[PDB]
Each structure stands twice: as structure tokens, then as C-alpha cells.
């Protein structure tokens, strides 16, 4: 499993993080997601034969938050 860091503009309060967190977590292949208001991003651990940094990016973008890929990490 790999790790992507998508930066996210437009998170203001916790309802925002929660919303983003609780539905991108429902997504399959997503092992783990942790969204941060402070540096305004999400970190996702994920099963790579299920999702790609672009599929996860687009999932967030379709929610009305502007998501752009910052860091891919893996082996």
C-alpha cells in the first residue's frame, strides 16, 4: 500500500474535514485517511491496484473542494 498527499483549499471548520474524511473513507481501497485543517491537506494510505493518486484527487475535487496532488509515497 502507498501514500498520497493531496492539498485541499476551502476547508474552514471541522464539518469540512469530517465530510471529506467520512466519505473518502467509505471509498474502497482506501486503507486510511487523515485530513488536516492546518496545512490544508489529506493523507491517504491506499491499496494501489484499486485507486490511483488521480482517482483519489478527483474524488475530493468532485465534492466542491479544490484538490491538487502534492506527494506520492511508496516502495
Amino acid at each position: 500500500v502507498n501514500s498520497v498527499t493531496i492539498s485541499v483549499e476551502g476547508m474552514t471548520c471541522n464539518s469540512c474535514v469530517w465530510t471529506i474524511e467520512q466519505q473518502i473513507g467509505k471509498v474502497n481501497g482506501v486503507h486510511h485517511i487523515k485530513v488536516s485543517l492546518e496545512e490544508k491537506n489529506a493523507t491517504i494510505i491506499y491499496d494501489p491496484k484499486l485507486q490511483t493518486p488521480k482517482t483519489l484527487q478527483e474524488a475530493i475535487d468532485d465534492m466542491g473542494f479544490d484538490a491538487v496532488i502534492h506527494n506520492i509515497e511508496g516502495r
Binding site: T12, C13, Q23, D62, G64
Partner: protein, 68 residues
């Protein structure tokens, strides 16, 4: 045509997401009331797609009818 939806909007950031999914569907002119948790869309798009657009927010939406 002026349809009217209920969208649970907690924060101001929640309301910014509604105007984005709307702006990307295009061909709408909207006004989002954050206190009253309501959206009105004037659009030739079908009620069913305008509905479908607004639940991409993750927020529970619902159709109240027309104004118009």
C-alpha cells in the same frame, strides 16, 4: 425555472462547496442561504441532475419544489 433545495450546511466552507459543484455543472445561476440551509437554482437542467449535482458534496439534500 427556479427549483429550490434543502442542503444541510453547517459552516461557511460547507456553502463554498455547494457553489463549486454548481459552478462546474455550469449553466446555472444560484443563490445559497447559509443560515436557512437552502439553495435556489434557476437552470434549464433537470431537477434530477441539479439534485444529483448537489449531493456530490457529501451533504444530505432534498427537493422542496418550486418558487418559482
Amino acid at each position: 425555472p427556479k427549483h429550490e433545495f434543502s442542503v444541510d450546511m453547517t459552516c461557511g466552507g460547507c456553502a463554498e462547496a455547494v457553489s463549486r459543484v454548481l459552478n462546474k455543472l455550469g449553466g446555472v445561476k444560484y443563490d445559497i442561504d447559509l443560515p436557512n440551509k437552502k439553495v435556489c437554482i434557476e437552470s434549464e437542467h433537470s431537477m434530477d441532475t441539479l439534485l444529483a449535482t448537489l449531493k456530490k458534496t457529501g451533504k444530505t439534500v432534498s427537493y422542496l419544489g418550486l418558487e418559482i
